[PDB]
Amino acid sequence: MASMAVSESQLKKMVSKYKYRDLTVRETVNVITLYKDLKPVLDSYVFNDGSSRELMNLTGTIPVPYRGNTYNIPICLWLLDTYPYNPPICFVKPTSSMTIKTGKHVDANGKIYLPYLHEWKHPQSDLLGLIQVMIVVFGDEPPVFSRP
């Protein structure tokens, strides 16, 4: 029904250096088919060691209902080149008009912490599952504020 953003074939070229390419591509297709404001992008990730690698991330918004409105929560999900056997590294990405609300699941840099990420195991864990969890958690406790 809706338009295509990126195809499987194009994605496969983007993750050409990933160790488990078909698995990564299939899950990415399922995510962006369902969440149409999440876009796959190739970008440089800087680890704590100082090393950097070109990684695909999913960036955009997911829809989260909260007290009578539906909010588009901006997120970024980085896929390591060993995806799906390591969890994504996940961030909320506030605009200039937003603040990060820190708590048990979100730090001051916007990094997300979840049992689902800590317990990650393929094939029981996957991105679709992760996003459902984020929607529940963020629906209970919004991770970005924009008004008093």
Short mmCIF file of N, CA, C and O in Angstrom, two decimals:
data_model
loop_
_atom_site.label_atom_id
_atom_site.label_comp_id
_atom_site.label_asym_id
_atom_site.label_seq_id
_atom_site.Cartn_x
_atom_site.Cartn_y
_atom_site.Cartn_z
N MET A 1 0.84 -1.24 0.00
CA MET A 1 0.00 0.00 0.00
C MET A 1 0.86 1.27 0.00
O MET A 1 0.69 2.12 -0.87
N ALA A 2 1.78 1.41 0.96
CA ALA A 2 2.63 2.61 1.04
C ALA A 2 3.82 2.46 0.12
O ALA A 2 4.07 1.36 -0.39
N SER A 3 4.58 3.54 -0.06
CA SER A 3 5.69 3.54 -1.02
C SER A 3 6.92 2.84 -0.42
O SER A 3 7.06 2.74 0.79
N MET A 4 7.82 2.40 -1.26
CA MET A 4 9.03 1.76 -0.81
C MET A 4 10.10 2.81 -0.64
O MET A 4 10.24 3.70 -1.47
N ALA A 5 10.82 2.72 0.47
CA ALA A 5 11.92 3.60 0.78
C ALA A 5 13.22 3.03 0.25
O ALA A 5 14.01 3.73 -0.40
N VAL A 6 13.45 1.75 0.55
CA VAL A 6 14.67 1.06 0.13
C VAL A 6 14.33 -0.41 -0.12
O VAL A 6 13.54 -1.00 0.62
N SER A 7 14.99 -1.03 -1.06
CA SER A 7 14.73 -2.43 -1.34
C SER A 7 15.77 -3.33 -0.68
O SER A 7 16.84 -2.88 -0.24
N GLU A 8 15.42 -4.61 -0.61
CA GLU A 8 16.28 -5.64 -0.07
C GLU A 8 17.64 -5.63 -0.74
O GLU A 8 18.68 -5.71 -0.07
N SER A 9 17.63 -5.49 -2.06
CA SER A 9 18.85 -5.48 -2.86
C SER A 9 19.73 -4.30 -2.55
O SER A 9 20.96 -4.41 -2.52
N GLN A 10 19.11 -3.16 -2.34
CA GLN A 10 19.89 -1.98 -2.00
C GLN A 10 20.48 -2.14 -0.58
O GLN A 10 21.66 -1.83 -0.33
N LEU A 11 19.69 -2.68 0.34
CA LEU A 11 20.16 -2.90 1.70
C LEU A 11 21.36 -3.85 1.73
O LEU A 11 22.32 -3.63 2.46
N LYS A 12 21.26 -4.91 0.93
CA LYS A 12 22.30 -5.92 0.87
C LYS A 12 23.61 -5.26 0.44
O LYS A 12 24.65 -5.57 1.00
N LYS A 13 23.56 -4.31 -0.49
CA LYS A 13 24.77 -3.55 -0.82
C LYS A 13 25.27 -2.70 0.35
O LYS A 13 26.47 -2.56 0.54
N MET A 14 24.35 -2.12 1.12
CA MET A 14 24.74 -1.29 2.26
C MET A 14 25.44 -2.07 3.38
O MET A 14 26.35 -1.53 4.03
N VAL A 15 25.00 -3.30 3.63
CA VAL A 15 25.60 -4.13 4.69
C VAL A 15 26.57 -5.17 4.15
O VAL A 15 26.78 -6.23 4.74
N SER A 16 27.16 -4.85 3.00
CA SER A 16 28.07 -5.75 2.33
C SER A 16 29.20 -6.24 3.24
O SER A 16 29.75 -7.29 2.99
N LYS A 17 29.57 -5.48 4.26
CA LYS A 17 30.65 -5.92 5.16
C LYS A 17 30.13 -6.62 6.44
O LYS A 17 30.92 -7.01 7.30
N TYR A 18 28.82 -6.81 6.56
CA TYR A 18 28.28 -7.46 7.76
C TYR A 18 28.56 -8.97 7.72
O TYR A 18 28.69 -9.53 6.64
N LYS A 19 28.72 -9.62 8.88
CA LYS A 19 28.96 -11.04 8.94
C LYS A 19 27.75 -11.91 8.66
O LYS A 19 27.92 -13.03 8.19
N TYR A 20 26.55 -11.39 8.93
CA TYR A 20 25.30 -12.13 8.73
C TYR A 20 24.35 -11.22 7.94
O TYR A 20 23.38 -10.69 8.46
N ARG A 21 24.64 -11.07 6.66
CA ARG A 21 23.98 -10.10 5.84
C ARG A 21 22.48 -10.39 5.57
O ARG A 21 21.64 -9.50 5.75
N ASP A 22 22.15 -11.61 5.17
CA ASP A 22 20.75 -11.95 4.85
C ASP A 22 19.87 -11.77 6.07
O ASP A 22 18.76 -11.22 5.98
N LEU A 23 20.36 -12.17 7.24
CA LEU A 23 19.59 -12.03 8.46
C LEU A 23 19.39 -10.55 8.81
O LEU A 23 18.29 -10.13 9.21
N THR A 24 20.43 -9.75 8.64
CA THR A 24 20.34 -8.33 8.97
C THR A 24 19.38 -7.65 8.01
O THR A 24 18.55 -6.83 8.42
N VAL A 25 19.47 -8.01 6.74
CA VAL A 25 18.65 -7.38 5.73
C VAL A 25 17.18 -7.75 5.92
O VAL A 25 16.32 -6.85 5.87
N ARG A 26 16.90 -9.01 6.19
CA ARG A 26 15.52 -9.45 6.35
C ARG A 26 14.84 -8.72 7.53
O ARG A 26 13.69 -8.22 7.42
N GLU A 27 15.55 -8.60 8.65
CA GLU A 27 14.96 -7.91 9.80
C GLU A 27 14.77 -6.42 9.52
O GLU A 27 13.77 -5.81 9.94
N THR A 28 15.73 -5.81 8.83
CA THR A 28 15.64 -4.39 8.48
C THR A 28 14.42 -4.12 7.56
O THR A 28 13.72 -3.13 7.73
N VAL A 29 14.22 -4.98 6.56
CA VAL A 29 13.07 -4.89 5.68
C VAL A 29 11.79 -4.94 6.52
O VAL A 29 10.92 -4.09 6.37
N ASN A 30 11.70 -5.89 7.44
CA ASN A 30 10.50 -6.01 8.22
C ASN A 30 10.26 -4.75 9.06
O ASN A 30 9.12 -4.29 9.19
N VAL A 31 11.33 -4.15 9.58
CA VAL A 31 11.17 -2.96 10.39
C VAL A 31 10.68 -1.79 9.55
O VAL A 31 9.72 -1.11 9.91
N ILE A 32 11.33 -1.53 8.43
CA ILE A 32 11.02 -0.30 7.72
C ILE A 32 9.75 -0.48 6.92
O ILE A 32 9.14 0.50 6.54
N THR A 33 9.30 -1.71 6.72
CA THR A 33 8.00 -1.93 6.07
C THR A 33 6.85 -1.54 7.00
O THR A 33 5.84 -0.99 6.57
N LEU A 34 7.06 -1.75 8.28
CA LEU A 34 6.07 -1.49 9.30
C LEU A 34 6.18 -0.06 9.87
O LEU A 34 5.16 0.64 10.05
N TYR A 35 7.40 0.39 10.11
CA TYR A 35 7.64 1.71 10.70
C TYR A 35 8.22 2.60 9.62
O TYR A 35 9.42 2.69 9.45
N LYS A 36 7.35 3.30 8.95
CA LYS A 36 7.74 3.95 7.71
C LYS A 36 8.55 5.22 7.90
O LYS A 36 9.09 5.72 6.94
N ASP A 37 8.65 5.71 9.13
CA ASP A 37 9.48 6.88 9.42
C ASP A 37 10.85 6.46 9.99
O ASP A 37 11.58 7.30 10.51
N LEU A 38 11.18 5.17 9.93
CA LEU A 38 12.55 4.69 10.22
C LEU A 38 13.27 4.44 8.91
O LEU A 38 12.77 3.75 8.04
N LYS A 39 14.43 5.05 8.77
CA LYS A 39 15.20 5.02 7.54
C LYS A 39 16.57 4.39 7.78
O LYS A 39 17.27 4.77 8.72
N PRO A 40 16.99 3.47 6.90
CA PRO A 40 18.36 2.90 7.00
C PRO A 40 19.38 3.84 6.42
O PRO A 40 19.19 4.40 5.34
N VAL A 41 20.44 4.05 7.18
CA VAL A 41 21.48 4.98 6.83
C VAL A 41 22.82 4.36 7.17
O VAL A 41 22.93 3.64 8.15
N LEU A 42 23.82 4.64 6.36
CA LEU A 42 25.19 4.20 6.61
C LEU A 42 25.96 5.36 7.22
O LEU A 42 25.95 6.46 6.67
N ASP A 43 26.56 5.15 8.38
CA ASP A 43 27.22 6.24 9.10
C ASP A 43 28.36 5.71 9.99
O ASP A 43 28.43 4.51 10.29
N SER A 44 29.25 6.60 10.40
CA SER A 44 30.43 6.22 11.16
C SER A 44 30.08 6.19 12.63
O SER A 44 29.48 7.14 13.15
N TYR A 45 30.40 5.08 13.29
CA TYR A 45 30.15 4.94 14.73
C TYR A 45 31.48 4.95 15.45
O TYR A 45 32.38 4.22 15.05
N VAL A 46 31.58 5.75 16.50
CA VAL A 46 32.82 5.84 17.28
C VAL A 46 32.70 5.11 18.61
O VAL A 46 31.96 5.53 19.50
N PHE A 47 33.43 4.01 18.74
CA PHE A 47 33.41 3.21 19.97
C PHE A 47 34.13 3.92 21.11
O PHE A 47 34.68 5.00 20.93
N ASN A 48 34.10 3.31 22.29
CA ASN A 48 34.76 3.88 23.47
C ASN A 48 36.28 3.75 23.35
O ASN A 48 37.02 4.58 23.87
N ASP A 49 36.72 2.71 22.65
CA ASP A 49 38.14 2.48 22.43
C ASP A 49 38.75 3.54 21.52
O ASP A 49 39.97 3.65 21.41
N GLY A 50 37.89 4.31 20.86
CA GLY A 50 38.34 5.31 19.90
C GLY A 50 38.27 4.83 18.47
O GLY A 50 38.37 5.62 17.54
N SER A 51 38.11 3.52 18.29
CA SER A 51 37.97 2.95 16.95
C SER A 51 36.66 3.44 16.32
O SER A 51 35.72 3.81 17.03
N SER A 52 36.62 3.46 14.99
CA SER A 52 35.40 3.80 14.26
C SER A 52 35.15 2.83 13.10
O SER A 52 36.09 2.35 12.46
N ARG A 53 33.89 2.49 12.89
CA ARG A 53 33.49 1.62 11.79
C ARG A 53 32.24 2.20 11.12
O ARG A 53 31.45 2.91 11.76
N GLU A 54 32.09 1.90 9.83
CA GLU A 54 30.93 2.30 9.07
C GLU A 54 29.85 1.28 9.39
O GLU A 54 30.02 0.10 9.10
N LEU A 55 28.76 1.73 10.00
CA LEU A 55 27.65 0.85 10.37
C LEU A 55 26.33 1.38 9.85
O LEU A 55 26.14 2.60 9.69
N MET A 56 25.40 0.46 9.57
CA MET A 56 24.05 0.85 9.23
C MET A 56 23.31 1.15 10.54
O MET A 56 23.45 0.45 11.55
N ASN A 57 22.55 2.23 10.52
CA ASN A 57 21.63 2.45 11.62
C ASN A 57 20.24 2.72 11.04
O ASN A 57 20.09 3.04 9.87
N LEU A 58 19.26 2.49 11.88
CA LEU A 58 17.90 2.86 11.61
C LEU A 58 17.61 4.14 12.40
O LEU A 58 17.65 4.16 13.62
N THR A 59 17.28 5.19 11.68
CA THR A 59 17.03 6.48 12.29
C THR A 59 15.72 7.08 11.82
O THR A 59 15.35 6.96 10.65
N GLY A 60 15.05 7.76 12.73
CA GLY A 60 13.73 8.31 12.47
C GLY A 60 12.87 8.32 13.71
O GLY A 60 13.37 8.51 14.80
N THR A 61 11.57 8.17 13.56
CA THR A 61 10.68 8.21 14.70
C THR A 61 9.84 6.96 14.71
O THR A 61 9.63 6.34 13.67
N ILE A 62 9.41 6.58 15.91
CA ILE A 62 8.38 5.58 16.12
C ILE A 62 7.23 6.25 16.85
O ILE A 62 7.44 7.12 17.71
N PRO A 63 5.99 5.83 16.54
CA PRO A 63 4.78 6.43 17.12
C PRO A 63 4.51 5.84 18.51
O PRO A 63 4.60 4.62 18.68
N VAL A 64 4.35 6.70 19.51
CA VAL A 64 4.11 6.25 20.89
C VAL A 64 2.92 7.05 21.48
O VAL A 64 3.04 8.26 21.74
N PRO A 65 1.84 6.37 21.80
CA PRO A 65 0.70 7.02 22.45
C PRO A 65 1.00 7.33 23.88
O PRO A 65 1.61 6.53 24.60
N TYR A 66 0.66 8.54 24.26
CA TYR A 66 0.81 8.95 25.63
C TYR A 66 -0.25 9.99 26.04
O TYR A 66 -0.24 11.12 25.56
N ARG A 67 -1.12 9.60 26.96
CA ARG A 67 -2.15 10.45 27.55
C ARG A 67 -2.90 11.28 26.53
O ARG A 67 -3.02 12.49 26.66
N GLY A 68 -3.42 10.63 25.50
CA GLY A 68 -4.35 11.29 24.60
C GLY A 68 -3.75 11.83 23.33
O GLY A 68 -4.48 12.29 22.46
N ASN A 69 -2.43 11.76 23.20
CA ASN A 69 -1.80 12.11 21.94
C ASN A 69 -0.84 11.01 21.53
O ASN A 69 -0.36 10.23 22.36
N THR A 70 -0.53 10.97 20.25
CA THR A 70 0.45 10.07 19.70
C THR A 70 1.65 10.92 19.39
O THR A 70 1.51 11.91 18.68
N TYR A 71 2.78 10.56 19.97
CA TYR A 71 4.06 11.26 19.77
C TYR A 71 5.00 10.46 18.91
O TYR A 71 5.01 9.21 18.94
N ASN A 72 5.71 11.20 18.06
CA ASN A 72 6.75 10.63 17.22
C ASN A 72 8.09 10.75 17.94
O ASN A 72 8.70 11.78 17.93
N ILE A 73 8.51 9.67 18.59
CA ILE A 73 9.74 9.67 19.37
C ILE A 73 10.95 9.39 18.48
O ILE A 73 11.01 8.35 17.82
N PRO A 74 11.89 10.34 18.43
CA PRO A 74 13.03 10.18 17.54
C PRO A 74 14.07 9.23 18.14
O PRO A 74 14.52 9.38 19.28
N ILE A 75 14.43 8.23 17.36
CA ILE A 75 15.36 7.21 17.82
C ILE A 75 16.41 6.90 16.77
O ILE A 75 16.30 7.29 15.61
N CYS A 76 17.46 6.21 17.21
CA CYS A 76 18.52 5.74 16.35
C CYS A 76 18.93 4.37 16.85
O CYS A 76 19.30 4.23 18.03
N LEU A 77 18.88 3.37 15.96
CA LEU A 77 19.27 2.00 16.31
C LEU A 77 20.47 1.58 15.47
O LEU A 77 20.33 1.41 14.28
N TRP A 78 21.63 1.42 16.09
CA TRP A 78 22.86 1.00 15.39
C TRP A 78 22.97 -0.50 15.37
O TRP A 78 22.88 -1.15 16.42
N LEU A 79 23.16 -1.06 14.18
CA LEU A 79 23.40 -2.48 14.02
C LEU A 79 24.91 -2.77 13.90
O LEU A 79 25.57 -2.33 12.96
N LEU A 80 25.44 -3.50 14.86
CA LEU A 80 26.83 -3.97 14.77
C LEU A 80 27.01 -4.99 13.64
O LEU A 80 26.04 -5.59 13.17
N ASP A 81 28.24 -5.22 13.20
CA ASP A 81 28.40 -6.04 12.02
C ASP A 81 28.21 -7.52 12.35
O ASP A 81 28.32 -8.36 11.46
N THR A 82 27.97 -7.82 13.63
CA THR A 82 27.62 -9.16 14.08
C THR A 82 26.10 -9.31 14.34
O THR A 82 25.67 -10.34 14.88
N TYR A 83 25.32 -8.30 14.00
CA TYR A 83 23.85 -8.37 14.07
C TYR A 83 23.42 -9.60 13.25
O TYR A 83 23.95 -9.83 12.16
N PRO A 84 22.47 -10.41 13.75
CA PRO A 84 21.54 -10.34 14.89
C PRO A 84 21.97 -10.99 16.21
O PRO A 84 21.15 -11.08 17.14
N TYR A 85 23.24 -11.32 16.35
CA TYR A 85 23.71 -12.02 17.55
C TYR A 85 24.20 -11.11 18.67
O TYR A 85 24.41 -11.57 19.78
N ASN A 86 24.36 -9.83 18.38
CA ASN A 86 24.50 -8.79 19.40
C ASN A 86 23.36 -7.80 19.24
O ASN A 86 22.98 -7.52 18.12
N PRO A 87 22.86 -7.25 20.36
CA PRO A 87 21.77 -6.27 20.28
C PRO A 87 22.19 -4.96 19.62
O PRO A 87 23.37 -4.61 19.58
N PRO A 88 21.22 -4.24 19.09
CA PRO A 88 21.53 -2.93 18.58
C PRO A 88 21.92 -2.01 19.71
O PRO A 88 21.56 -2.23 20.87
N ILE A 89 22.66 -0.98 19.37
CA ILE A 89 22.95 0.10 20.30
C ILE A 89 21.94 1.20 20.02
O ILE A 89 21.87 1.69 18.90
N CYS A 90 21.17 1.56 21.03
CA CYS A 90 19.96 2.32 20.82
C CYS A 90 19.99 3.65 21.55
O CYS A 90 20.42 3.70 22.70
N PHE A 91 19.51 4.68 20.86
CA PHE A 91 19.48 6.07 21.39
C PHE A 91 18.16 6.73 21.08
O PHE A 91 17.56 6.48 20.02
N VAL A 92 17.70 7.56 22.02
CA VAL A 92 16.70 8.58 21.72
C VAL A 92 17.48 9.80 21.25
O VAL A 92 18.60 10.07 21.72
N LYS A 93 16.91 10.49 20.27
CA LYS A 93 17.60 11.58 19.58
C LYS A 93 16.77 12.84 19.62
O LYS A 93 16.09 13.16 18.64
N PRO A 94 16.81 13.55 20.75
CA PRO A 94 15.98 14.75 20.88
C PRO A 94 16.30 15.83 19.87
O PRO A 94 17.47 16.01 19.52
N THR A 95 15.27 16.51 19.38
CA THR A 95 15.50 17.76 18.64
C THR A 95 15.91 18.89 19.60
O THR A 95 15.90 18.71 20.81
N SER A 96 16.24 20.06 19.06
CA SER A 96 16.62 21.21 19.90
C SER A 96 15.47 21.67 20.80
O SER A 96 15.71 22.25 21.85
N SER A 97 14.22 21.39 20.42
CA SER A 97 13.10 21.81 21.27
C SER A 97 12.75 20.77 22.36
O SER A 97 11.83 20.99 23.16
N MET A 98 13.49 19.67 22.43
CA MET A 98 13.21 18.61 23.41
C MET A 98 14.30 18.47 24.44
O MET A 98 15.44 18.82 24.17
N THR A 99 13.97 17.86 25.57
CA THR A 99 14.99 17.42 26.52
C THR A 99 14.88 15.90 26.68
O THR A 99 13.81 15.35 26.56
N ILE A 100 16.00 15.26 26.98
CA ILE A 100 16.00 13.86 27.39
C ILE A 100 15.53 13.77 28.83
O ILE A 100 16.03 14.49 29.69
N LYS A 101 14.60 12.86 29.10
CA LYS A 101 14.21 12.56 30.48
C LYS A 101 14.93 11.29 30.91
O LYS A 101 14.67 10.22 30.36
N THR A 102 15.87 11.42 31.85
CA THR A 102 16.67 10.27 32.28
C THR A 102 15.93 9.44 33.31
O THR A 102 14.97 9.89 33.92
N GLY A 103 16.36 8.20 33.46
CA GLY A 103 15.72 7.27 34.34
C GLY A 103 16.41 5.91 34.23
O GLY A 103 17.50 5.80 33.70
N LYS A 104 15.71 4.88 34.70
CA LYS A 104 16.18 3.50 34.70
C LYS A 104 16.59 3.03 33.29
O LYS A 104 17.46 2.18 33.16
N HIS A 105 15.93 3.55 32.26
CA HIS A 105 16.10 3.04 30.90
C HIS A 105 16.74 4.00 29.91
O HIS A 105 16.99 3.62 28.77
N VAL A 106 17.08 5.20 30.36
CA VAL A 106 17.61 6.21 29.46
C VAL A 106 18.65 7.05 30.18
O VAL A 106 18.34 7.59 31.24
N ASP A 107 19.86 7.19 29.62
CA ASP A 107 20.87 8.04 30.28
C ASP A 107 20.92 9.44 29.64
O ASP A 107 20.15 9.76 28.72
N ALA A 108 21.79 10.29 30.18
CA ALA A 108 21.81 11.69 29.80
C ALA A 108 22.28 11.88 28.38
O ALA A 108 22.00 12.89 27.77
N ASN A 109 22.98 10.88 27.83
CA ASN A 109 23.35 10.90 26.40
C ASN A 109 22.23 10.34 25.48
O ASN A 109 22.35 10.31 24.25
N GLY A 110 21.15 9.88 26.08
CA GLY A 110 20.04 9.34 25.31
C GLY A 110 20.16 7.85 25.05
O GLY A 110 19.29 7.28 24.42
N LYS A 111 21.18 7.21 25.60
CA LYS A 111 21.35 5.79 25.42
C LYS A 111 20.28 5.01 26.19
O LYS A 111 19.92 5.33 27.34
N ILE A 112 19.77 3.98 25.55
CA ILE A 112 18.67 3.23 26.09
C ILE A 112 19.16 1.91 26.72
O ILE A 112 20.05 1.25 26.21
N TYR A 113 18.58 1.58 27.87
CA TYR A 113 18.89 0.35 28.57
C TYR A 113 17.60 -0.39 28.81
O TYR A 113 16.61 0.16 29.30
N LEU A 114 17.60 -1.66 28.45
CA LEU A 114 16.40 -2.45 28.58
C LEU A 114 16.74 -3.88 28.87
O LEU A 114 17.72 -4.38 28.34
N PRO A 115 15.92 -4.55 29.70
CA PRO A 115 16.10 -6.00 29.84
C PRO A 115 16.12 -6.71 28.49
O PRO A 115 16.90 -7.64 28.27
N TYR A 116 15.29 -6.28 27.56
CA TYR A 116 15.26 -6.91 26.25
C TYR A 116 16.63 -6.85 25.57
O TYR A 116 17.05 -7.80 24.89
N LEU A 117 17.35 -5.74 25.74
CA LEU A 117 18.68 -5.66 25.15
C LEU A 117 19.71 -6.51 25.90
O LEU A 117 20.52 -7.18 25.28
N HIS A 118 19.67 -6.48 27.23
CA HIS A 118 20.54 -7.30 28.07
C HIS A 118 20.33 -8.83 27.86
O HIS A 118 21.28 -9.66 27.89
N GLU A 119 19.08 -9.22 27.63
CA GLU A 119 18.76 -10.65 27.47
C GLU A 119 18.81 -11.11 26.03
O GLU A 119 18.47 -12.26 25.74
N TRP A 120 19.29 -10.25 25.14
CA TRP A 120 19.24 -10.51 23.68
C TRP A 120 19.83 -11.84 23.23
O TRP A 120 20.96 -12.15 23.54
N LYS A 121 19.06 -12.62 22.49
CA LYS A 121 19.49 -13.88 21.94
C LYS A 121 18.74 -14.14 20.64
O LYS A 121 17.52 -14.08 20.61
N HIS A 122 19.45 -14.44 19.57
CA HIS A 122 18.84 -14.78 18.31
C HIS A 122 18.51 -16.26 18.35
O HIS A 122 19.38 -17.04 18.68
N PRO A 123 17.31 -16.66 17.90
CA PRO A 123 16.28 -15.88 17.20
C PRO A 123 15.13 -15.40 18.05
O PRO A 123 14.20 -14.83 17.49
N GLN A 124 15.15 -15.61 19.36
CA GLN A 124 14.05 -15.20 20.20
C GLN A 124 13.89 -13.68 20.28
O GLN A 124 12.79 -13.16 20.36
N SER A 125 15.01 -12.97 20.29
CA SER A 125 15.03 -11.50 20.24
C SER A 125 15.10 -10.97 18.81
O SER A 125 15.84 -11.52 18.01
N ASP A 126 14.38 -9.89 18.47
CA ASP A 126 14.63 -9.25 17.16
C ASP A 126 14.19 -7.82 17.20
O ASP A 126 13.69 -7.36 18.22
N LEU A 127 14.43 -7.09 16.11
CA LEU A 127 14.18 -5.68 16.09
C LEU A 127 12.69 -5.36 16.27
O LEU A 127 12.33 -4.41 16.95
N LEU A 128 11.82 -6.14 15.64
CA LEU A 128 10.38 -5.89 15.75
C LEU A 128 10.00 -5.99 17.22
O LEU A 128 9.25 -5.15 17.77
N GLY A 129 10.57 -7.00 17.88
CA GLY A 129 10.30 -7.23 19.31
C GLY A 129 10.81 -6.08 20.16
O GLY A 129 10.14 -5.60 21.10
N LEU A 130 12.01 -5.58 19.82
CA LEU A 130 12.64 -4.48 20.54
C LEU A 130 11.76 -3.23 20.43
O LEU A 130 11.54 -2.53 21.41
N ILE A 131 11.26 -2.97 19.24
CA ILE A 131 10.49 -1.75 19.06
C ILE A 131 9.14 -1.81 19.80
O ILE A 131 8.67 -0.80 20.35
N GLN A 132 8.51 -2.97 19.83
CA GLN A 132 7.31 -3.15 20.65
C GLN A 132 7.63 -2.86 22.08
O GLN A 132 6.87 -2.17 22.73
N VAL A 133 8.79 -3.33 22.57
CA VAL A 133 9.14 -3.05 23.96
C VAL A 133 9.34 -1.55 24.18
O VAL A 133 8.91 -1.00 25.19
N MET A 134 10.01 -0.88 23.27
CA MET A 134 10.23 0.55 23.42
C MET A 134 8.90 1.28 23.46
O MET A 134 8.72 2.25 24.20
N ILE A 135 7.96 0.85 22.64
CA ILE A 135 6.67 1.51 22.60
C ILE A 135 5.95 1.33 23.94
O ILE A 135 5.33 2.27 24.45
N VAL A 136 6.04 0.16 24.53
CA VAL A 136 5.41 -0.01 25.84
C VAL A 136 6.11 0.85 26.90
O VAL A 136 5.48 1.57 27.68
N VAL A 137 7.42 0.77 26.93
CA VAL A 137 8.17 1.47 27.99
C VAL A 137 8.03 2.99 27.86
O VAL A 137 7.74 3.70 28.84
N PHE A 138 8.17 3.49 26.64
CA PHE A 138 8.12 4.91 26.43
C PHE A 138 6.71 5.44 26.60
O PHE A 138 6.51 6.60 26.93
N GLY A 139 5.72 4.58 26.36
CA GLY A 139 4.35 4.90 26.64
C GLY A 139 4.06 5.04 28.13
O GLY A 139 3.11 5.70 28.50
N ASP A 140 4.78 4.31 28.96
CA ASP A 140 4.65 4.42 30.42
C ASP A 140 5.48 5.59 30.92
O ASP A 140 5.06 6.33 31.79
N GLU A 141 6.66 5.77 30.33
CA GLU A 141 7.65 6.76 30.79
C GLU A 141 8.31 7.43 29.60
O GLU A 141 9.29 6.91 29.06
N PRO A 142 7.75 8.55 29.13
CA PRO A 142 8.30 9.17 27.93
C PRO A 142 9.77 9.57 28.14
O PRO A 142 10.13 9.99 29.23
N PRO A 143 10.61 9.32 27.14
CA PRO A 143 12.04 9.55 27.31
C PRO A 143 12.48 10.92 26.82
O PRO A 143 13.64 11.25 26.96
N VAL A 144 11.56 11.67 26.22
CA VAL A 144 11.81 13.03 25.81
C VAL A 144 10.63 13.89 26.18
O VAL A 144 9.47 13.47 26.02
N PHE A 145 10.94 15.06 26.74
CA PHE A 145 9.95 16.06 27.13
C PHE A 145 9.98 17.25 26.21
O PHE A 145 11.01 17.57 25.63
N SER A 146 8.85 17.95 26.07
CA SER A 146 8.91 19.15 25.28
C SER A 146 8.06 20.30 25.85
O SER A 146 7.99 21.34 25.24
N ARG A 147 7.47 20.12 27.03
CA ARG A 147 6.69 21.17 27.66
C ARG A 147 6.54 20.96 29.18
O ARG A 147 6.74 19.85 29.67
N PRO A 148 6.18 22.04 29.93
CA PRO A 148 5.99 21.91 31.37
C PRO A 148 4.70 21.13 31.68
O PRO A 148 4.43 20.76 32.83
#
